[PDB]
Every structure is written in structure tokens, then in C-alpha cells.
Design a protein around this ligand. Structure first.
Ligand SMILES: Nc1ncnc2c1ncn2[C@@H]1O[C@H](CSCC[C@H](N)C(=O)O)[C@@H](O)[C@H]1O
Ligand SMILES: Nc1ncnc2c1ncn2[C@@H]1O[C@H](CSCC[C@H](N)C(=O)O)[C@@H](O)[C@H]1O
Ligand SMILES: *C/C=C/[C@H]1O[C@@H](n2cnc3c(N)ncnc32)[C@H](O)[C@@H]1O
Ligand SMILES: *C/C=C/[C@H]1O[C@@H](n2cnc3c(N)ncnc32)[C@H](O)[C@@H]1O
Lengths: 12, 364, 342, 343, 364, 12
């Protein structure tokens, strides 16, 4: 899962 | 404990491991809109903190507690369940604030505070607001709040709006059509194409977009954190009745959220709307399984139903119909497994948005 | 079971959930170098499959079992622990191969096979070869292999070589130095800079690079799948003695791997080398927190030690020194959580 | 003597030995902007010099005195404390001006002029204007100035402006990080990394740059040489409030200066601005040990404090903060020991 | 004290201020030939250090003492006069060697050692070897050496050789001719042209060169540090008799130096010769006021006399003559005020060095 | 004086 690996998304 | 009961252990392990990384703290801290707004909300409402007792739920590195300390808080209890609680302790000592910030490692549902507090601060917003189910921990913490106490943030607004995006919709079948092949290295894959289509449509899209793809004003579902209780978030029913401002195909619903810090001096807003500067929450879009044709003036009505699950997320159920023609569509999505589609380019406006000749405006 | 003993439960759930998604099968399948090399190795060595009994460990969509069937296998047991076993079954039926390919759901450590097999096939390679620890499942499956049975792939070679990449180093160093600030919104973060550096450089870097950044010929660690026992992979010691071909700063060690399919007709190689076409494995580079200065002709010596952990990966220990000067660099990396720079 | 009291002996020996070399006089003289601007400022204001008595403070080779003589000065006392005074005397004789230019060897604070003067001329500006502390000698010489007398230059404007230059920062930061190594030939140097950073960023950087790197309009501090006192330059407090015009990282403050010759006929300016032709003064930049992030519209406020020391320079203290975020930077720099970066 | 007697206060202030900068320690430490050779000389002669008492004269950051510790020294007394003694103490603590390295701040001529030592180590070489006059402090430190003690380095060799470099010589007058103009902004500067020429010719030139500019095999003047006394370096007379290998105009003398670490196991050599990799000492060249024509086979004879001064340097007197013609030249130079001419370019060989056609050797 | 300013020369 993507939310299990990264709950918060990356911002540049 | 309330947390262990509603959370699967597998989800909790990966969840708090992720937040034990300093790199993830940095990503959040470097979100200027998010960190600066929290600072402005706290320092500009200094009376809400001066000589007060504070609780910071999920303090992470403790940055929000340092803001409360800058505002004059007498005592701050910073609770963090990840291993980040150790790094927050190191920062409390290095900043000579051991007398005013107490780091309590553990889950806010399981720790004990020596006393009640005047104000709770936290940053419990996931993408689409509700992901991670931290809002329930934030509300659970009100058991430590004095009768007259405040909450920073105080309320949250979730905004929903129908959008048109032919490329996003068609992309789901372009990706699935990998399986519509009679001889992949000699193997006919076509029997799985429908399963691939189903898999993509269960994913919300975490992205940004141009506001001109929205076809109606948003509807807002507000959560007053001072009044709401934990159970109010277990099942979130959001009815909508969109008055179409544009005619076209509606491919789904777009989501964003705002929060307000209602202080004694002023109210400060933190918005993740597509009209505002981008945040690390971006925006979220859920496609319909089939597009709905709507004319300007029609009403697109339906429900967005969010059902909390034990993986610290929600199962999303959307049903919508255009009242004037009865055309209906639906979809079921897993909020925990979105597709991160952001690329870094400026979002393009939908075709057919020029009402004056672009050639006449080359030399405006 | 052997698997549940060596694997934490939370890691196994996420692991097999990941491989249940068709999108993740598509990603691997569409790696044309990987998939085409496997097919060519099997079909060219059709004698190793003609009328043979086959075991496909971690068949996923079943693609490799279809290749063995194309090569003439009589029966293929395709073991898959994720929910992808369902989709593989659909493909076996839709391709009218129910008489030759038998999907067996479950972990190869826990299922029961009706008979022994003549050859085992699998794609158990993670990035840097050993991630995911599926090589142990591949070796564990030899309990079903006839005495002189074969294995596809037959051997695996891990290559390591020192590299210089000032740009990569400064990227990771600059990120970590965010925690050097004395006044982030008025907060002194500097007491965490050491922890930051330790964390960021604990991440191996997955991307591709040009061979020109390598400062010495690589050393090779070989796993012979025909001979190895799964216990051999719990602790992997790789000593190295690099003869520096260029002067400059050694910023870390680069990793990649080749596997060989040693068939009766021919041996076929699948390579993830930085000189070969890109695969979904890319290459892997472990950075030193502080680079070592070396002169051409010096020897960079040390040990790369891989200790398997219960999250289906390895804790990597790299100790290296420039022998002529005694400059040493020690680093610990988490192979499970790399930084994808590509 | 006033000079010996505010100057350490080991600093004065080296200082005046430096200016005894003809090569150093050539370096200043060949600066065409400096020398040409001084000449035109004097000749165009010839009424300020015609039949007047002139004092040249630190005449060096005597070039400024020859300009005053060209303008019609009746008598010029050229004071010079280095052995350059002997070479200036040779030039006065070889140019047949012994009747009008009198070279007086020694420090202007320790010599005796036979009479008072109508105008003082000098080139006392150092890097960032104040280095060398010769401005105090220039002001000290006002003891010999007549009530209605003038000063050339008349005023000095030092300008400050925040800049962004990631390349410059990373050069200095990388040098200091040499002392982060844990195994230099097997020796752990890391315990000195903090001390190294303090040392490298204590050095102001002397070179030139494009105006593009400036993030806000400059702030100006003015010294009026006609009315300022020697003691006014012992402690110089320069408060600043910069309205940021661009977003990005503020890596420090950039410094330059203009001087004005306020003559009776016209006013002539000599500028070391980064938008003007290069002079041997270049420009000066004081780096923050850690940059400050600012947004367009923010305000960068603080104070630049210069405290004169007995080595003929200043200890610079720069404190700055982004008001909107409270992000602060504090730095101490030694103006005497800059890093000359111009390649 | 012996140091204060022979040194002017102003010179000592500038001198030790310079060596208090970490940046200057880095410059020396990053000279790989210099630091690497010292490490090898010490570690490969481990028997000269194993369980021995060591004195490190002018230890700076202490790097040489750490090498002695790596070789097995029981006790090391690291004397340093600049404020770098503080930074060295920090390094001794951080490296957990306080029991084996004792940093003594102050001048080796003025401090007290609790005992005598078996071996003295130091890096007392300035450019042209003798500049800075630290060799005398190195020899002075022998008052702490046991009767049969060793010294690292043990001997020093200064090499002299005549060179031809028309460009270097002519550049002196090109620079001075700035003053040979009759109207510099209306001022005749010509009367100072001779003074400018004098000023440039008093400066030795520090840079590197191609060995083919040398016109004769070098002459070597050796200092044996085991035997030499402080007073031997107050007046250094170096006679020379050069037998010309090439015909041309002799423009001056080039200087470089080597040192030898004569250990029990081996002798390690550190060379700054123009045939070796560049060091931070480079090489040093002193011009003649007038060039001397010599033909191959002639003898160029004369004396190089170094007279120590109270500014920690030497006044250089060079006299030379071509015996076959009697043509003589001389010059007086200040070793303390050299001109740093190094640009970073590879030195070009003297013209007229091609004995075969370069065009025929294109493509090889 | 160049020697008073820098006894030891800079090596790039
Ligand atoms: N212990 C185990 N037992 C059975 N399958 C396993 C396993 N460990 C990993 N796997 C499976 O092995 C597969 C490896 S990746 C898929 C490879 C497949 N042959 C293809 O080319 O498409 C995954 O599907 C994973 O679910
Ligand atoms: N206190 C003092 N008294 C007299 N001369 C001084 C002095 N302090 C510095 N100087 C001299 O002033 C000179 C400054 S450089 C200016 C040289 C000359 N006026 C020109 O414009 O070309 C130096 O040569 C220095 O020796
Ligand atoms: C979105 C940010 C969440 C932060 O709060 C922490 N956190 C999550 N859940 C809890 C509970 N129950 N108690 C304490 N802290 C919690 C996350 O680790 C993150 O820092
Ligand atoms: C080339 C310089 C070497 C180091 O030696 C130090 N040093 C010079 N002279 C002395 C005396 N007399 N005592 C102690 N240390 C001395 C220099 O400071 C430099 O670090």
C-alpha cells in the first residue's frame, strides 16, 4: 500500500 | 486501550515507524504554509497560551510545543507515540525548556497527564483530512481539557466539488490495457484486464489541478473539534447537491480541506484549496466508474460516505446522480492506497476555456 | 514454519499485500530485459524442461510457469503466497494450460507438493540482490528438488566497487544539514544534526550511474544456488581489497548483481550492471558519512557485512580504510528503506 | 599620541611597512576610477583650491597633492607616515613643485603644521569603508582645518543589502567541513568542526557580484566628514529593516560605499557599487553561518555593529532575523582578515 | 628567553597569529606529500617510537603527535606557541589520548618538560628551508634530548642551481616601467623608476618551473640536525662552483630542499625538488640584478650568504661570476618578502628545447 | 610584507 508506506506525501 | 481496539497492529507498526524518521519531520516542517500558519495562529493569539497549560497531541519533533513556548505557555505536555519522542526530548533540553515542555512518549489514549490543560494543539490532518484517523486521537484528548478549554485547530472544513478531467479518466483504461494483450511473450493476459481496471478505480488520486476543471461550487462538511466526539468520525456521511455552473462530463469528485484556529484575538485559517499555494497535502480526487453528463443549471446530488477501518483509514463510497436525467454512477475507493500522481508541472486548464481569441492576446 | 520464524508478522502482511496488486506485477513483467532474458534462458534450454516436473517459487502472475510450459514441461507447480495466486489461476485456465500448470496458494515453506521436481525456477532477486530475503525461500524449496536437479537461476554474483559522486554526497549531506539550523522558526535544531546524518546516510541510494564514477575494478561475491543452504544467507561477509585506479574522494560503494542460468544447451546471463540496459533493479550505492581520500595505486580494504533481520531485509555494515593512510569509514545502512533518487 | 593610544605597535609596524612599497602605491594609482575621479573632483572645483592652503592626509606617492597643485593651490602640506614620504619628495623635486608641495613625514596625529588649511584632501577609505581606521586620522586632521574649511571627500555612504549566493556559502561551508572528518590519516578532527565554522565565517569575503543576487533595496549609513568626530567611529551602530523583494535564502549582507566631493562648483561622486565599474575596493560580503529563509514581502531586521579594535580595524557583529518567523542569525566577523575571493 | 632575544615583538605577533588559524593548519595538513611522508616516516620506523618519550616541537593541531601515538609512543609532549595549542588539546581529548599526549602551550624555548625524551619530531621547514627560523627552535629543543636520542627529521639538504628565465627577468622591468611615463594624470613619475626596479629585485620568487631551465647540476648544503647548534644558523655561507651544462644567460639561482628521517628500520625522504610532486613549499628563485652569459663548460662560482635577522627570516646576499670572463653579478634579497608568482599552470620548458622536429612527432 | 602575512604558501 502507498498510504502504509507514506501517510504524508512529499512536498518539494 | 481505545487506540489498540480500533487499530490493527500491522498498520500501527508501519504507521509509527514512518513518523520515527527525521526526514518525514523535515518534509512537514519545510511546508511553509503549514508550519508558518501554525506559528502565526499561536503567536498572534498569545493570550490563549500566556501562562496556560498546553497539550500537544502527536508533537513529532515538538515544533508546535516550541511555538506555544514562544507564546508564553507555563507548561506544555508533548505526547508522541513514534520514536520521534526521543528526538523531541533532545530538542527540549538543547533549547533550555525542560522546565516548560514535558515530552511524554506513547499514545495519547494510553499515557497519563498529571493535570488538565487549558488548550490542546495538534496537527492531526491527513490527506482528505480524515486519513490516518488522527482526528479521533485529537478528540479523545479532550478528556484532559478543562471545561472552558480551547482547541488549535478548532474546526475543520472538508470541501467536495465535481470535476471534469477526460485525461485522468481515460488513463485508467490505458494503464489497464497492458493486460488486453493476446500474446505477452506468448501468454494471453486479457482475462485480467477487468481486474486491473477495478484495481485502479479503487485508488483515489493525490494530485493538484487547475480550478477550471471544477464544475460547481464546493459543498463543505464541517467538524467542530470542540463539540464533536470520537464516534462522530467512525461513519462520516457527506450529502451533496451540486448546482452545475458548467456543462460537461463529470468524472468524479475533488476533495480538499481547511482548518481554523479560533483564538481570543483573531481566527487564522490554514487552507489546502487548489486556489491556494500548494501544501504537502495537495488535493484528492475520486473518480466515478462512469462519467455523468450534466448541463449547466442541473443538480448533481448524492452522498460521499466514509467508513473508518482498522488500518487507520477509511473505505470511501461515492454515489451521485444528475437529477434532471436520472443518470447515476458510483465508486468504492480505499483512502489508504491512493495513487500519487503529482509530477511537478503547472496544472493545465481544461480545453475550451478561451472565451477570447488567444491569437489576439499574444501581444496584449 | 521456517518463514514465520524468520519474518515479523507486520512485515509479511505488507510484503504479500504489495505483491497482490496487479500494478506491481505489471511493473516487473514490463521489465523487458528481465522477462525476455528469463524466457530466452528457458526456451533455449528446452531440454532442461521437456517432460520435466517444475516448481516455480513465487510465481506471481505465473509468467515463468508459462515459459516452462512453452519449453515442454509435463507438470509445473506454481507456488504463490499473495492473492496473485487467484489471478494466476485465471490465466492458467484462460490459456488452456490446466493440464500442465498447477497453482498452489501459500508459502513455499508451508505448502505440500505431491512429488519431487526436476528443476526449480524463480525470480527471487531484490535490489542489491538480497533484499526481501526471498533467496532463502528459493533455497528452502530445494527440499523438493531431485538429487541432480537444476535451478534457474543457477548462481548469483554480487559486485561492489568504490565510487566518487560529489553531487550525490552533497545532496544527502545538504538534506541532513537541515537539522544544523540554530533558528528554524526560532527553534535550535542543531543538537539533532548528528542523528539526521546517521538517518539519511542509513538509506541506500537506488538509481543508475555511469561506470566512469567507479574508482576500482569490482569485487564479486558468488552465491551458488545449487550448493548453498538457506542458513548461509543469514550472515553474509564480503571482504574487499580494492586497487584504486583513480585519485580522489571515495564517497561510498556501488552494488549490482548478475545471475546465470546454467542450462544443458547454454548458459544465459541476466545483468543489472551500470554498463547494461536499465532494469527495474537499477543499481545500489551506500554512501559514507564522510568520504575517504585515496590516491591512484592505493588499496581500499574492508568488509561489507550483511546481517539478515526479521523485516525481510538486511542491516548492512560497511567498514573501509585507505591502507596507506589509515583513514577509516564505518557505516550502517537499512537495506529495507532505500532512497529512490531516479 | 592619539594614534599610538588606539593602535597596537605590532599592527602599526606592519601597516606602514605595507604602504612603504612602491608596488602598493602603483596598485592604488592604477585604479583609474579612483584616481581619475579624484582628479576631476579637484580640477572641476578649482575655486576650492585656487590660492588655498591644503593638507593631504596620507599622501603616499603624493598624487593627490599634485592634483591640488594643478588646481592652483598656493601651499600643500603632504603628510605621510610610511617611508613613501621620501619617494614623494623625489617626485616633488622632479616635477619642479618644491615651492608649493611640502612633504611632512610622520603621522598626522604626531606632526606639527606651520599653519591652518582651507581644505583637507585624503583617500582614507578601506575595504567596507572603515577598515584601517584611517577615517579617524582624516577626522583628527580637522585640528588644522579653518572654520570655513572643506573636506575632500566630504561625506561617505556605506550601503548594506541582503544577498543570496548558494555557491559562495557552500564554498566556505565545505572548507570548514574539512574538520568534520572522523579519520584524517586516522585522526578524528570532528571535535573542531564548530570552531572551524566560526573561523571561516569570521572572514568577510572581498570580491564582486551582480546586483541580481541582492534581495532588497540597500540601507545607507552616512558619515559626514565635515561634522563627525574621531570618537564617532569607535562604535558604529547600523540598524536595518529590509523589505524583501524576492523569496529565497538570505546568506548574508553585502557592503559597498560611495563618497561625495561636495565642492563649490559641483558635487562629484566616487562609487564602489556592484553596478559601477570595478575598483580595487571591490565589494564586501559577510556570510551568515546559517542562511535565513525569507519570503517576498517579509522584513529582515537587525543591527550591524562595528566596534573598533587596536589592530586598525573593526570587530563586526551582525544580528538579523526574519520578523514573520523569528528565525535569527548572529555572527561575528574580523574586518582585518578578509578572504580575497576574486580569482 | 632565547626566542625573545632573537625575535622582534611585532614579527612574533604576526607569526603566531597566522599559525592560530585552523585554515592554515588545513593547508599544511592537506599537503599530501608533506603529511603522508611524515606519517610513513614515523609508522615505518615504529621501533623509534614504541614505548618511547617524544617531544613534538611546534605541534600545531597535534597531527604529528597522533602519528607518534599510532606508532606506540608511551608519552608525547606537544609544545605549541600559537593559540592552536587549545585546538590540539581538544583533539587529544576527543581522541581519548590524554594519558599519552600532553599539550604544553608556549614557546619551546620557555616551557618546562617533566623529563627528557628519546626522540624529537617537528616540521620546522620554511620555504627555502630556513625562513621562519624555526630550525633554531628545533635545534634548541635538543636540550631535552637524551644523549643518544634521535631527531625526525634528522638532516636537511638545501640545493642551489643556476637557471635561465628571460621572461621572469624581463617582467621585473615591465612592472617597474609603470613609473617611466612623463604624465601620469599630469605627473612625471620617471624619477621613481629605479626605486621600483630595486624593490622588485629584493623579492625572491616563490613558484615552480620546468627543470630544463636549470643550467647546471645542483649544489647541496647539508644541515645535520643531530650535530648542528643554534648559532650555526645565524650566518649560513653556501659557496658554489657550477659547471655549466648549457649555454645561455644566467638570471639567478633556484633553491629547493629535501629532508631525511633516518630511522632504525629505514630512512624516509621528503623532497620539495622540481622533479617531485609540488608541495606547499614550492621552490624559491633569486634573480641576479644583471644576467651572466655562460657557455657550456664554463664555471659559475660565487657565494650565497644568508644572514639571520630579527624578523624570523634572512637577508640574502648572492654573488656570482663567470670565471672564464670575469663577468660578475650580485643581489640582495629579503627572504621574508617573496613574490608569490604561482599561477597554477604547468611550467613551460625553455624555448629551443626541441632537438627533433615537433611536426614529425605529431601523431607520434 | 608577504611573509608576515603568510609564512606558509597556499597549496590548492
Ligand atoms: N515465501 C514465499 N512463498 C511463496 N511465494 C513468495 C514467497 N516470498 C515471496 N513470494 C512471491 O514471489 C513473487 C516474486 S516477484 C514475482 C515473480 C514472478 N515469477 C514474475 O515474474 O512475475 C511475489 O509474487 C511474491 O508474492
Ligand atoms: N595616521 C596617518 N598619518 C599619516 N599618514 C597615514 C596615516 N595612516 C595612514 N597613512 C598613509 O595614508 C596612505 C593611504 S593610501 C592613499 C595614498 C594617496 N593619498 C593616494 O591617493 O594615492 C598610506 O600610504 C599610509 O601610509
Ligand atoms: C499527522 C501527524 C501525526 C503525528 O502524530 C503522531 N501520532 C499519531 N497517532 C498518535 C497517538 N495516538 N498518540 C500520539 N502520537 C500520535 C504521529 O506519530 C505523528 O508524529
Ligand atoms: C612551520 C611551523 C610549524 C609550527 O611550529 C610552531 N612554532 C614555531 N616556533 C615555535 C616555538 N618557538 N615554540 C613552539 N611552537 C613554535 C608554529 O606556530 C607552527 O604551528
Amino acid at each position: 500500500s502507498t498510504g502504509g508506506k507514506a501517510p504524508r506525501k512529499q512536498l518539494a | 486501550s481505545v487506540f489498540s481496539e480500533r487499530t490493527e497492529e500491522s498498520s500501527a507498526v508501519q504507521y509509527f515507524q514512518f513518523y520515527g524518521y527525521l526526514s518525514q519531520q523535515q518534509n512537514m516542517m519545510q511546508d511553509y504554509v503549514r508550519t508558518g500558519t501554525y506559528q502565526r495562529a499561536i503567536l498572534q493569539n498569545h493570550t490563549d497560551f500566556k501562562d496556560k497549560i498546553v497539550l500537544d497531541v502527536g508533537c513529532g519533533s515538538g515544533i508546535l510545543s516550541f511555538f506555544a513556548a514562544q507564546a508564553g505557555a507555563r507548561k506544555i505536555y508533548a505526547v508522541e507515540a513514534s520514536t520521534m519522542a526521543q528526538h523531541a526530548e533532545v530538542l527540549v533540553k538543547s533549547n533550555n525548556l525542560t522546565d516548560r515542555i514535558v515530552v511524554i512518549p506513547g499514545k495519547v489514549e494510553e499515557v497519563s497527564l498529571p493535570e488538565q490543560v487549558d488548550i490542546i494543539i495538534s496537527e492531526p490532518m491527513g490527506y482528505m483530512l480524515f486519513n490516518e484517523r488522527m482526528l479521533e486521537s485529537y478528540l479523545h484528548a479532550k478528556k484532559y481539557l478543562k471545561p472552558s478549554g480551547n482547541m488549535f485547530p478548532t474546526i475543520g472544513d472538508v470541501h467536495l466539488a465535481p470535476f471534469t478531467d477526460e485525461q485522468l479518466y481515460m488513463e485508467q483504461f490505458t494503464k489497464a490495457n497492458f493486460w488486453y494483450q493476446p500474446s505477452f511473450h506468448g501468454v494471453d493476459l486479457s482475462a485480467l484486464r477487468g481486474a486491473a481496471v477495478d484495481e485502479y478505480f479503487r485508488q483515489p488520486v493525490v494530485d493538484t489541478f487547475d480550478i477550471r476543471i471544477l464544475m460547481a461550487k464546493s459543498v463543505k462538511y464541517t467538524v467542530n473539534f470542540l463539540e464533536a466526539k470520537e464516534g462522530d468520525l467512525h461513519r462520516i456521511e457527506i450529502p451533496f447537491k451540486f448546482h452545475m455552473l458548467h456543462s460537461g462530463l463529470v468524472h468524479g469528485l475533488a476533495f480538499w480541506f481547511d482548518v481554523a484556529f479560533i483564538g481570543s484575538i483573531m481566527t487564522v485559517w490554514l487552507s489546502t484549496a487548489p486556489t491556494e499555494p500548494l501544501t504537502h497535502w495537495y488535493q484528492v480526487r475520486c473518480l466515478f466508474q462512469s462519467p455523468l453528463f450534466a448541463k449547466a443549471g442541473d443538480t448533481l446530488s448524492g452522498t460521499c460516505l466514509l467508513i473508518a477501518n482498522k488500518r487507520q483509514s477509511y473505505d470511501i463510497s461515492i454515489v451521485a446522480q444528475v437529477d434532471q436525467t436520472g443518470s447515476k454512477s458510483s465508486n468504492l475507493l480505499d483512502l489508504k492506497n491512493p495513487f500519487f500522481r503529482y509530477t511537478g508541472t503547472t496544472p493545465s486548464p481544461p480545453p475550451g476555456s478561451h472565451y477570447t481569441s488567444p491569437s489576439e492576446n499574444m501581444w496584449n
